[PDB]
Design a protein around this ligand. Structure first.
Ligand code: HEC
Ligand code: HEC
Length: 190
C-alpha cells in the first residue's frame, strides 16, 4: 500500500498534465483523482515497463506522453503516487443527451445480439468500479480519454488487460459510434 503524503511529493512532473490533484480539464489526459489505488498502481507499473526506451514491443502499456518518466521511481514510489491520487476527490463532467442516451443503453444493457456484456456488472451502475476486484472507476472520466481506451482495446493498441483478457473482448464488439456514445455517458456518470 502507498503513503499518500509521501506521494504528494513525488508528482511534480505530473502536474502540468494531470493537475496537482489529478483533475485537470485537459480532455485527453485521464483524471486520476479518486481512481482506485490498486488500479493506479498497476497502470503505473505497466506504463513504466512499456514506456521505457528499448522496452520490448508489446510489453506493458506504452504511453508516448510519459516515455521514460516513471523510470527513476521505485515500486514503493509508485504505490505512494497511487495512494496520493486515489485520496483525491474525483469530479464529474458533461453528458450530452444527444450521445449519452444511447451510451446509457449500451452501458446498462450491452449488445447481447453480439455477445457483449453490459458494463455495469464490473464498473458499477454509477461507474465507481471495484478497486478490490481490479475494476477501474470510469464515472466522470474525460470522454476523449475513455474513447481512446475503448478504441485502443478494440484495435490491440492497449494490451495490458492480459491478466483477465476482459476488455479486448468487450471492446471488439463496439463501433465508433458506440464508443462515442459510451464515453459521453460515462463523462456524466456518478
Ligand atoms: C502530459 C505530457 C503528461 C504527463 C506529464 C504525465 N502524464 Fe500520465 N498520462 C498522460 C496521457 C496522455 C495518458 C493517457 C495515454 C492514453 O492512453 O491515451 C496518461 C495516463 C496516465 C495514467 C493511466 C490512467 C488510467 O486511467 O488508466 C496514469 C496512472 C498516469 N498517467 C500517471 C501519471 C503520473 C503519476 C505522472 C507523473 C509521474 C504522469 N502521469 C505524467 C499524460 C501525462
Ligand atoms: C468485467 C467483466 C468488465 C466488463 C463487462 C467491462 N469492463 Fe471495462 N474493464 C475491466 C477491467 C478488469 C479493466 C482493467 C484493465 C487494466 O488495464 O487493468 C477495465 C478497464 C476499462 C477501461 C479503462 C479505464 C482507464 O482508466 O483507462 C475502460 C474505459 C473500460 N473498461 C470501459 C468499459 C465499458 C465501456 C464497458 C462496457 C461496454 C466495459 N468496460 C465492460 C472489466 C470490465
Amino acid at each position: 500500500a502507498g503513503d499518500a503524503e509521501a506521494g504528494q511529493g513525488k508528482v511534480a512532473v505530473c502536474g502540468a498534465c494531470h493537475g496537482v490533484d489529478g483533475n485537470s480539464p485537459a480532455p485527453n489526459f485521464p483524471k486520476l483523482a479518486g481512481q482506485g489505488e490498486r488500479y493506479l498502481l498497476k497502470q503505473l507499473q505497466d506504463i513504466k515497463a512499456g514506456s521505457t526506451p528499448g522496452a520490448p514491443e508489446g510489453v506493458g502499456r506504452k504511453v508516448l506522453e510519459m516515455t521514460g518518466m516513471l523510470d527513476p521511481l521505485s515500486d514503493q514510489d509508485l504505490e505512494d503516487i497511487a495512494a496520493y491520487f486515489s485520496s483525491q476527490k474525483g469530479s464529474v463532467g458533461y453528458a450530452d443527451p444527444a450521445l449519452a442516451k444511447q451510451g446509457e443503453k449500451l452501458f446498462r444493457g450491452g449488445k447481447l445480439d453480439q455477445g457483449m456484456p453490459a458494463c455495469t456488472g464490473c464498473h458499477a451502475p454509477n461507474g465507481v468500479g471495484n478497486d478490490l476486484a481490479g475494476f477501474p472507476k470510469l464515472g466522470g472520466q474525460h470522454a476523449a480519454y475513455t474513447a481512446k481506451q475503448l478504441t485502443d482495446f478494440r484495435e490491440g493498441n492497449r494490451t495490458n488487460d492480459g491478466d483477465t483478457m476482459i476488455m479486448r473482448g468487450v471492446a471488439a464488439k463496439l463501433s465508433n459510434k458506440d464508443i462515442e456514445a459510451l464515453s459521453s455517458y460515462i463523462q456524466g456518470l456518478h
